Design a protein around this ligand. Sequence first.
Ligand SMILES: FC(F)c1nc2ccccc2[nH]1
Ligand SMILES: FC(F)c1nc2ccccc2[nH]1
Ligand code: NA
Ligand code: NA
Lengths: 171, 171
Amino acid sequence: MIRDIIRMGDKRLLRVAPQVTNLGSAELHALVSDMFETMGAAHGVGLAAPQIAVDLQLMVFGFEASERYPEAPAVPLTALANAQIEPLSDEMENGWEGCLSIPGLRAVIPRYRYIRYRGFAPDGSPIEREAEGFHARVVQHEYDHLVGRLYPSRIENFDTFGFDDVLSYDL
Amino acid sequence: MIRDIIRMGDKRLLRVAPQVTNLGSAELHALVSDMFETMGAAHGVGLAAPQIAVDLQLMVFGFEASERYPEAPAVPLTALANAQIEPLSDEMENGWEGCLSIPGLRAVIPRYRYIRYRGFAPDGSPIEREAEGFHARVVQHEYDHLVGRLYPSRIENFDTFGFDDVLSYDL
Ligand SMILES: FC(F)c1nc2ccccc2[nH]1
Ligand SMILES: FC(F)c1nc2ccccc2[nH]1
Ligand code: NA
Ligand code: NA
């Protein structure tokens, strides 16, 4: 089932989400399957549970081909609960992000180039990966939703923030 | 004539505009008359020349009744060239702003409660006023366009930035 994506300004995107405690259940699997489905209809690359007004530490992400980022390499289709993230280095890198909760807009945002992330697949097996570049950016961005944080509060150069069909900033 | 309002992301909103040097002319009066007209069709309270892709230190503003700010007091209908602004005190005050170049969105923004502003009416007589509260906020906000600055770069609390029809932050 496709769920409404709530838009920036809803208080529900501003909460600290509690942990997922129903790993391996049929309710989690249905909620995850709804998320991939919702992500896909909106042509997302990442979607976090609080974006559909579900207060949980859960995110889906990944794709082969992105309509929005035709230059990005495949990121594996992933559902991750109870995400924890550690930078593997201090190197930052700028890149364009948008967000299905902030339709029409984008900005350049600095993110760690290299991370490890850990948590659980919805069946409850542990997931643990090193990620870099766009894969890492997607995960950091979706994690931010689980702590009530959207990308505008991370913009350093406001010249790069604008509507997607009007911008000609060259990164 | 109603002119297109260019949207955030256009480089033309990011320039430092030169001064108006055709005070009292028929070209300025036509451009000003276009601005009030454009402001009015979009239900604006302020419009700055760079918002219609005109690179000049010129802004129009004011209204009796605002559809957008039904709680605001009348601000006189004003066209101002070569605006210069000085705070009359250090007191800041938060208030909701939006912007016709960033449709659909609003945020709370701190501004000086008290200013003086000076410049010229389009006929070239000097204008010099003390302003406070919403009147002062409008003028400071439009001035920012004349230096290539939009309101997101002024937001301090990103919880208050969201779409107009979804927000329930209580100022
Ligand atoms: F525009 C949206 F499709 C969107 N969602 C994202 C999630 C992470 C990084 C970039 C993103 N862009
Ligand atoms: F939403 C728009 F109509 C708009 N334009 C503005 C100009 C100054 C202050 C607040 C404003 N809000
Ligand atoms: Na919060
Ligand atoms: Na600039």
